Design a protein around this motif. Structure first.
Motif, mmCIF file in Angstrom:
data_model
loop_
_atom_site.group_PDB
_atom_site.id
_atom_site.type_symbol
_atom_site.label_atom_id
_atom_site.label_comp_id
_atom_site.label_asym_id
_atom_site.label_seq_id
_atom_site.Cartn_x
_atom_site.Cartn_y
_atom_site.Cartn_z
ATOM 1 N N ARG E 7 0.816 -1.213 0.000
ATOM 2 C CA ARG E 7 0.000 0.000 0.000
ATOM 3 C C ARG E 7 0.851 1.266 0.000
ATOM 4 N N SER E 8 2.038 1.207 0.591
ATOM 5 C CA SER E 8 2.901 2.380 0.621
ATOM 6 C C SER E 8 3.569 2.611 -0.731
ATOM 7 C CB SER E 8 3.936 2.217 1.727
ATOM 8 O OG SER E 8 4.748 1.084 1.481
ATOM 9 N N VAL E 9 3.894 1.534 -1.444
ATOM 10 C CA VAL E 9 4.608 1.676 -2.707
ATOM 11 C C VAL E 9 3.669 2.156 -3.803
ATOM 12 C CG1 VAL E 9 6.138 0.477 -4.334
ATOM 13 C CG2 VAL E 9 6.089 -0.188 -1.923
ATOM 14 N N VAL E 10 2.412 1.706 -3.772
ATOM 15 C CA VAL E 10 1.449 2.034 -4.816
ATOM 16 C C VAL E 10 1.125 3.524 -4.802
ATOM 17 C CG1 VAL E 10 -0.913 1.652 -5.571
ATOM 18 C CG2 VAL E 10 0.507 -0.272 -4.954
ATOM 19 N N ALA E 11 0.859 4.071 -3.617
ATOM 20 C CA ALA E 11 0.589 5.498 -3.506
ATOM 21 C C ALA E 11 1.833 6.339 -3.749
ATOM 22 C CB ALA E 11 -0.001 5.812 -2.137
ATOM 23 N N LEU E 12 3.022 5.766 -3.562
ATOM 24 C CA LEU E 12 4.240 6.473 -3.927
ATOM 25 C C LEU E 12 4.400 6.548 -5.438
ATOM 26 C CD1 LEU E 12 6.743 7.856 -2.868
ATOM 27 C CD2 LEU E 12 7.916 5.663 -2.930
ATOM 28 N N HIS E 13 3.993 5.500 -6.155
ATOM 29 C CA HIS E 13 3.950 5.580 -7.609
ATOM 30 C C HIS E 13 2.876 6.554 -8.070
ATOM 31 C CE1 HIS E 13 3.005 4.327 -11.766
ATOM 32 N NE2 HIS E 13 4.297 4.052 -11.830
ATOM 33 N N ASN E 14 1.815 6.708 -7.282
ATOM 34 C CA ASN E 14 0.836 7.750 -7.552
ATOM 35 C C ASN E 14 1.378 9.138 -7.255
ATOM 36 O OD1 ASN E 14 -1.323 6.043 -8.381
ATOM 37 N ND2 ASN E 14 -1.715 5.537 -6.231
ATOM 38 N N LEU E 15 2.323 9.248 -6.321
ATOM 39 C CA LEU E 15 2.893 10.547 -5.983
ATOM 40 C C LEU E 15 3.704 11.111 -7.138
ATOM 41 C CD1 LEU E 15 4.453 11.443 -2.469
ATOM 42 C CD2 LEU E 15 5.705 11.894 -4.563
ATOM 43 N N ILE E 16 4.434 10.253 -7.847
ATOM 44 C CA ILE E 16 5.193 10.708 -9.000
ATOM 45 C C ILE E 16 4.249 11.014 -10.153
ATOM 46 N N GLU F 32 8.747 -14.147 -1.971
ATOM 47 C CA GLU F 32 9.274 -13.751 -3.270
ATOM 48 C C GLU F 32 8.566 -12.534 -3.832
ATOM 49 O OE1 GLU F 32 8.980 -17.125 -5.797
ATOM 50 O OE2 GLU F 32 10.606 -18.222 -4.810
ATOM 51 N N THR F 33 7.361 -12.235 -3.341
ATOM 52 C CA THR F 33 6.685 -11.002 -3.712
ATOM 53 C C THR F 33 7.466 -9.792 -3.241
ATOM 54 O OG1 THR F 33 5.415 -10.970 -1.669
ATOM 55 C CG2 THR F 33 4.504 -12.175 -3.530
ATOM 56 N N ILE F 34 8.076 -9.891 -2.058
ATOM 57 C CA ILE F 34 8.829 -8.783 -1.480
ATOM 58 C C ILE F 34 10.020 -8.428 -2.359
ATOM 59 C CG2 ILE F 34 10.119 -8.058 0.560
ATOM 60 C CD1 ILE F 34 8.313 -10.025 2.136
ATOM 61 N N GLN F 35 10.716 -9.430 -2.875
ATOM 62 C CA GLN F 35 11.813 -9.110 -3.771
ATOM 63 C C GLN F 35 11.335 -8.792 -5.180
ATOM 64 O OE1 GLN F 35 14.493 -12.374 -3.766
ATOM 65 N NE2 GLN F 35 13.099 -13.776 -4.833
ATOM 66 N N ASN F 36 10.105 -9.167 -5.543
ATOM 67 C CA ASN F 36 9.521 -8.591 -6.752
ATOM 68 C C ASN F 36 9.211 -7.119 -6.545
ATOM 69 O OD1 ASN F 36 8.000 -11.701 -7.302
ATOM 70 N ND2 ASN F 36 9.432 -10.748 -8.735
ATOM 71 N N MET F 37 8.607 -6.781 -5.400
ATOM 72 C CA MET F 37 8.250 -5.396 -5.127
ATOM 73 C C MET F 37 9.468 -4.521 -4.888
ATOM 74 N N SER F 38 10.588 -5.112 -4.460
ATOM 75 C CA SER F 38 11.829 -4.352 -4.354
ATOM 76 C C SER F 38 12.289 -3.874 -5.720
ATOM 77 C CB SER F 38 12.912 -5.205 -3.705
ATOM 78 N N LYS F 39 12.137 -4.711 -6.742
ATOM 79 C CA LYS F 39 12.509 -4.318 -8.089
ATOM 80 C C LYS F 39 11.516 -3.345 -8.702
ATOM 81 C CE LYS F 39 14.211 -7.369 -10.908
ATOM 82 N NZ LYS F 39 15.611 -6.889 -11.065
ATOM 83 N N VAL F 40 10.304 -3.255 -8.158
ATOM 84 C CA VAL F 40 9.369 -2.247 -8.641
ATOM 85 C C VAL F 40 9.773 -0.872 -8.133
ATOM 86 N N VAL F 41 10.173 -0.791 -6.862
ATOM 87 C CA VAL F 41 10.635 0.471 -6.297
ATOM 88 C C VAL F 41 11.965 0.866 -6.922
ATOM 89 C CG1 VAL F 41 11.109 1.650 -4.100
ATOM 90 C CG2 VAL F 41 9.392 -0.137 -4.210
ATOM 91 N N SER F 43 12.496 0.238 -10.095
ATOM 92 C CA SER F 43 12.065 0.776 -11.374
ATOM 93 C C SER F 43 11.333 2.100 -11.225
ATOM 94 C CB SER F 43 11.179 -0.233 -12.096
ATOM 95 O OG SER F 43 9.975 -0.452 -11.387
ATOM 96 N N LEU F 44 10.961 2.479 -10.001
ATOM 97 C CA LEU F 44 10.441 3.819 -9.781
ATOM 98 C C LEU F 44 11.515 4.884 -9.912
ATOM 99 N N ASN F 46 13.520 5.079 -12.355
ATOM 100 C CA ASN F 46 13.671 5.345 -13.774
ATOM 101 C C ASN F 46 12.517 6.147 -14.348
ATOM 102 O OD1 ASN F 46 16.140 3.890 -14.028
ATOM 103 N ND2 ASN F 46 14.972 1.975 -14.011
ATOM 104 N N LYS F 47 11.574 6.580 -13.510
ATOM 105 C CA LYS F 47 10.526 7.487 -13.945
ATOM 106 C C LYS F 47 10.229 8.584 -12.938
ATOM 107 N N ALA F 48 10.786 8.519 -11.732
ATOM 108 C CA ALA F 48 10.615 9.566 -10.732
ATOM 109 C C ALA F 48 11.927 10.208 -10.321
ATOM 110 C CB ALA F 48 9.918 8.997 -9.491
ATOM 111 N N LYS F 49 12.906 9.395 -9.906
ATOM 112 C CA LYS F 49 14.174 9.909 -9.397
ATOM 113 C C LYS F 49 14.973 10.610 -10.486
ATOM 114 N N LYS F 50 14.985 10.051 -11.694
ATOM 115 C CA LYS F 50 15.618 10.741 -12.808
ATOM 116 C C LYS F 50 14.815 11.963 -13.236
ATOM 117 C CE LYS F 50 12.858 9.439 -16.500
ATOM 118 N NZ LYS F 50 12.414 10.283 -17.635
ATOM 119 N N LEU F 51 13.492 11.920 -13.077
ATOM 120 C CA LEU F 51 12.608 12.812 -13.816
ATOM 121 C C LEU F 51 12.350 14.116 -13.070
ATOM 122 N N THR F 52 11.784 14.037 -11.875
ATOM 123 C CA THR F 52 11.542 15.246 -11.107
ATOM 124 C C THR F 52 12.714 15.492 -10.170
ATOM 125 O OG1 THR F 52 9.977 16.435 -9.696
ATOM 126 C CG2 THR F 52 10.364 14.116 -9.211
#
Lengths: 480, 40, 32, 40, 30, 52, 257, 153
Positions: E7-16, F32-41, F43-44, F46-52
């Motif tokens: 839930r924290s990561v999804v709304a953070l992707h919404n923040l960007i 294994e979802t946790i390490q999937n979600m680690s790779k999502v953050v 990949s964030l 590459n569209k947030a940290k670089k961008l704004t």
């Protein structure tokens, strides 16, 4: 004259190129938009003044032959700066002194000529009511006098220049400080000159009557304005109270000035560190490490950061005092690697159970620790070495003689080898009993820790924490 | 920008944990085994 | 006349609480 | 004195002006959006 | 604990997704 | 070789035999979802940290 | 030069008819000048070097008559004198033996916080030099871990002055501590082993401890009451607290804030 | 322990401690963070004849300690030895909270003064009209109607 007349004539105008664009744009703005209409909570002139401190930190190095900055002072100080129709001639005076450097020779300010460069706020209808000008027209000469610091019969020229700014500082404290941000934009000019007010005094002078003046400065703070006056007047209050033995630590506990609630992201970041060492130095361990961590992850992206070379050292001093240790060289640098190798060799001894391995460090690098000023916390790690070891041995060996543990910890005495184990149980490190008649220390084998309540306590800290960051992602999103 | 008022002035992690264990303990433990046979 | 500022900023706090409660007490009914 | 009896809170009863307006904005932007989507 | 972590990561992707629509219109529109 | 599971004793030869399928499905298929979600953050960036 | 005092101060006058006259002599200091540190007139030191020598010896006999609340009065006043940046004697034959003496009695005062905030005032005078102040800080260091015998090896090593009233309180705070640490999970101990773990051969002082706490007086025996059985198996204490917490999860889960 | 001298109850030192608290309570405004009783009872043990001078120095230290209300109450008991102190840079500190609470007490008064009223301290209430005179004195009068209506007088 050829080696002069090709390498000396471009240092005057190309700084004159960039000084008609940075503080002339600040003088064009912060006289008419700080004394003028407004510079709001979302202002630019503070960050513009942040742009005119950092650029001039590493701009000037030389003693200024060819009047390349020695002619800027007879230019930039003959300034009324009252209103646009009287500064339209002054916009020519930004160019009228350029040929004074070029056609003729000016007065080369080489360590003597700063005294006819300070007495000008009478010349041609200058004022001090417009302190968005005059507090900046203090700091536009008050910085480059003291930026190099040059420390050779100069200190009185720095002083009398501060005295005229201290005269502006008393008009700040008394005369019409409301909604013009006369306190706010000059609380920075208060704060930024204090570091030049200190490194003069931390070099050759005293320290303590300024503190009562700082109490008089803290007097009017939060007494007219509660924004960036509560913040910078307390780190600059603490900066030698930590290094002194005066009261200043249980005072700061019960002090109301702990929260200014906003301090511009870089003075707020170290703010949790100067009081982070206060809990470290007066034995408050577990509370300190979270305001040490919070003082780390709010700092900007510079490289020559020698105070950050100290907070990363100090943050896991107190965590060696608590037991936990991260990899400290996880962000190791070419400038961090040399600042870790004596201190990284210390925590090598902590993760081991050897006793005089601590002594093999404290004679090799006992002098290095006193340079960083941290030895008084280093000396007490022997309590934490022996509790690491007694947890290490009791978990490994089940039924070990008490006349064997002392020879492995090089304790040289079995008769108190019972006694640390007594304080190990009194503290609660190991549970089980000691056959003092026989000599063995038996330990019970661990049982079902899975069907105990305690992993829910590993959850309930983090269930509630992870719902907070989902809420903070909601609260920080819909600004459009 | 970048003011910082100065008051004073994988490839890496797993082996550091392995450096912590055998820091001064049997680095080239190769030839004591040739000498532990006749002793033990 | 600092107390004119007092009373007008009092009116300010009052009417701002007014508007805040008015905007706030719909997020349920609008959705429903 | 009596001057320093009622000045410290009028200093920032002006600073406490636009907080609740910012609340109005952060709320009402979405509120108007909701009303608009509904009548849409 | 897993589901709240998501839930924290999804709304953070919404923040960007609001910082893409804040900064990229103030220069464009004004 | 785990074809049978149990324990062997050395003093008198006692084979304490026990069995339980403990649990496998609940945790590691949620780990294994946790390490999937680690790779999502990751990949964030590459569209947030670089961008704004 | 207004002294009235240089005859009966070095020789022992144990609680005789001098102390009221001594305080009345310290009265005649206060008519002439305050003990304010006198920032001006650095040359005049008779109010500073001669008057403080009265105040440091005035703290010296404050321990010999067992005068504890009036002892911390004079020593706090001496702390406000060496705080002065005005140039004085750097020390004397007493300043180690008085400043570290406050370190050794506040050790007994059961306030460890003020034991460690002294350490600002002398960085190098603890380890690399000033061995007479190494001994009190190493002592409370040895009291920090379990070490008790090296503590009383330092009761074979008292170099500077007598330190009598401090180590005798340090006896008493160790007497209940072993009487505290006899109460761990032990087996039978005969009437010789834990009889000599403090410092007793065979008086009736052991019955003064054996009837204070448990470990019952028996046939050469200390009986072990290591039950620790009553407290576990609590579902209820979670079931009150967690039912609060689960609804607290649902507050910041569905209701918009 | 620049105030631990109060351990001596002899009246000569009790009258010398006030003789000293004039120019020595200035520096270590943090070293007196815990001196409530040695000021209130020392201000009621009449050997310390300038009993309200000790309340003066306690209001000096406790506002420094952030104990604005403790410094405030030690200004209350500080009699006319404080009530005449009205126009300076630090006296204005402890003459913020006094009427900061007296003004609401008198709001409740002028709302309903019939019975069950708050105890008029005569020093919390003393400098009230005495500073209303300052509203007369320096000839600033718009701030006086606001003072009165704020204190509901």
């Amino acid at each position: 004259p050829p080696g002069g007349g090709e390498q000396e004539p471009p240092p005057p105008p190309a700084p004159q190129d960039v000084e008609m664009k940075e503080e002339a744009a600040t003088g064009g703005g912060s006289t008419g938009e700080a004394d003028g209409k407004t510079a709001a909570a979302a202002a630019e002139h503070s960050q513009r003044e942040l742009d005119t401190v950092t650029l001039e930190d590493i701009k000037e190095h030389v003693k200024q032959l060819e009047k390349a900055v020695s002619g800027k002072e007879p230019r930039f100080v003959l300034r009324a700066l009252r209103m646009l129709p009287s500064t339209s001639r002054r916009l020519n005076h930004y160019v009228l002194y350029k040929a004074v450097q070029g056609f003729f020779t000016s007065n080369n300010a080489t360590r003597d000529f700063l005294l006819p460069f300070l007495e000008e706020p009478m010349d041609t209808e200058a004022d001090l009511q417009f302190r968005p000008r005059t507090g900046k027209a203090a700091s536009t000469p008050l910085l480059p006098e003291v930026e190099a610091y040059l420390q050779l019969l100069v200190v009185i020229f720095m002083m009398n220049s501060k005295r005229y700014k201290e005269a502006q500082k008393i008009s700040d404290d008394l005369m019409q400080k409301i909604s013009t941000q006369n306190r706010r934009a000059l609380d920075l000019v208060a704060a930024k000159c204090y570091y030049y007010h200190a490194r003069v005094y931390e070099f050759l002078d005293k320290l303590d009557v300024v503190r009562s003046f700082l109490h008089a400065r803290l007097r009017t703070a939060t007494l007219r304005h509660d924004a960036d006056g509560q913040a910078t007047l307390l780190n600059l209050l603490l900066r030698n109270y930590l290094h002194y033995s005066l009261y200043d630590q249980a005072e700061k506990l019960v002090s109301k000035s702990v929260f200014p609630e906003q301090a511009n992201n870089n003075e707020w970041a170290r703010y949790l560190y100067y009081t982070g060492r206060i809990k470290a130095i007066q034995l408050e361990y577990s509370e300190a490490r979270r305001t040490m961590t919070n003082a780390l992850r709010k700092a900007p992206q510079h490289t020559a950061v020698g105070f950050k070379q100290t907070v990363h050292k100090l943050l896991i001093v107190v965590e060696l005092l608590l037991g936990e240790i991260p990899d400290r060289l996880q962000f190791r640098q070419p400038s961090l690697k040399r600042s870790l190798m004596p201190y990284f060799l210390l925590t090598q001894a902590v993760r081991t159970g050897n006793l005089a391995k601590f002594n093999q460090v404290l004679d090799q690098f006992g002098e290095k620790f006193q340079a960083d000023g941290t030895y008084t916390l280093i000396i007490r790690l022997r309590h934490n070495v022996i509790k690491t070891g007694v947890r290490m041995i009791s978990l490994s060996y089940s039924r070990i003689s008490l006349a064997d543990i002392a020879q492995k910890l090089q304790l040289d005495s079995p008769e108190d080898a019972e006694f640390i184990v007594a304080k190990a149980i009194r503290d609660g490190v190991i549970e089980a009993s000691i056959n003092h008649e026989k000599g063995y220390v038996q330990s019970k084998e661990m049982i079902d820790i899975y069907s105990t309540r305690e992993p829910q306590l590993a959850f309930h800290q983090r269930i509630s924490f992870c719902l907070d960051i989902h809420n903070m992602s909601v609260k920080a999103m819909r600004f459009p | 920008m970048s003011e910082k008022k100065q008051p004073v002035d994988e490839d890496n992690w797993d082996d550091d944990n392995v450096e912590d264990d055998f820091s001064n303990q049997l680095r080239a433990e190769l030839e004591k085994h040739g000498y532990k046979m006749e002793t033990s | 006349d600092l107390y004119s500022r007092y009373k007008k900023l009092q009116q300010e706090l009052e009417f701002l609480e007014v508007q805040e409660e008015y905007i706030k007490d719909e997020q349920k009914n609008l959705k429903k | 004195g009596l001057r320093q009896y009622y000045l410290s809170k009028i200093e920032e009863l002006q600073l406490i002006v636009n907080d609740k307006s910012q609340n109005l904005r952060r709320l009402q932007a979405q509120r108007n959006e909701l009303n608009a989507k509904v009548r849409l | 604990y897993l589901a709240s972590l998501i839930r924290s990561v999804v709304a953070l992707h919404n923040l960007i997704n609001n910082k893409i629509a804040n900064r990229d219109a103030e220069k464009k529109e004004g | 070789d785990k074809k049978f599971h149990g324990i062997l004793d050395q003093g008198e030869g006692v084979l304490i035999i026990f069995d339980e399928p403990p649990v496998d499905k609940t945790y590691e298929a949620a780990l294994e979802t946790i390490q999937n979600m680690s790779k999502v953050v990751d990949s964030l960036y590459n569209k947030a940290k670089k961008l704004t | 030069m207004y002294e009235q005092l240089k005859g009966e101060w070095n020789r022992k006058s144990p609680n005789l008819s001098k102390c009221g006259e001594e305080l009345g002599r310290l009265k005649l200091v206060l008519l002439e000048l305050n003990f304010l540190p006198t920032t001006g007139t650095k040359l005049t030191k008779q109010q500073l070097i001669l008057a403080r020598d009265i105040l440091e010896i005035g703290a010296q006999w404050s321990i010999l008559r067992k005068d504890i609340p009036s002892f911390e009065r004079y020593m706090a006043q001496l702390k406000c004198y060496y705080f002065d940046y005005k140039e004085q004697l750097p020390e004397s034959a007493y300043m180690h033996q008085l400043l570290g003496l406050n370190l050794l009695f506040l050790l007994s005062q059961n306030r460890v916080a003020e034991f460690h905030t002294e350490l600002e005032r002398l960085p190098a005078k603890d380890i690399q030099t000033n061995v007479y102040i190494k001994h009190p800080v190493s002592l409370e260091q040895y009291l920090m871990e379990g070490s008790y015998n090296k503590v009383f090896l330092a009761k074979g090593n008292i170099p500077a002055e007598s330190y009598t009233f401090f180590i005798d309180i340090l006896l008493d705070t160790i007497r209940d501590e072993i009487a505290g640490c006899i109460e761990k999970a032990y087996e039978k101990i005969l009437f010789t082993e834990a009889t000599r773990i403090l410092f007793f051969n065979t008086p009736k002082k052991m019955t003064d401890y054996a009837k204070k706490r448990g470990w019952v007086l028996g046939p050469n025996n200390y009986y072990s009451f290591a039950s620790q059985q009553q407290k576990p198996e609590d579902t209820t204490i979670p079931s009150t607290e967690l039912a609060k917490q689960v609804i607290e999860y649902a507050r910041q889960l569905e209701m918009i804030v | 322990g620049i105030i631990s001298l109060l351990d001596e109850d002899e009246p000569q030192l009790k009258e010398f401690a006030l003789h000293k608290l004039n120019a020595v309570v200035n520096d270590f405004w943090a070293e007196i963070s815990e001196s409530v009783d040695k000021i209130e009872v020392l201000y009621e043990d009449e050997g310390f004849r300038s009993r309200q001078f000790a309340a003066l120095v306690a209001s000096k230290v406790f506002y420094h300690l952030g104990a604005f209300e403790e410094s405030l109450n030690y200004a209350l008991g500080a009699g006319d030895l404080f009530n005449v102190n009205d126009n300076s840079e630090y006296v204005e500190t402890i003459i913020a909270k006094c009427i900061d609470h007296y003004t609401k007490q008198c709001v409740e008064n002028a709302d309903l003064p019939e019975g069950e009223k708050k105890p008029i301290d005569q020093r919390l209430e003393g400098i009230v009209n005495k500073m209303f005179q300052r509203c007369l004195d320096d000839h600033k009068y718009k701030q006086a109607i606001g003072i009165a209506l704020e204190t509901r007088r």
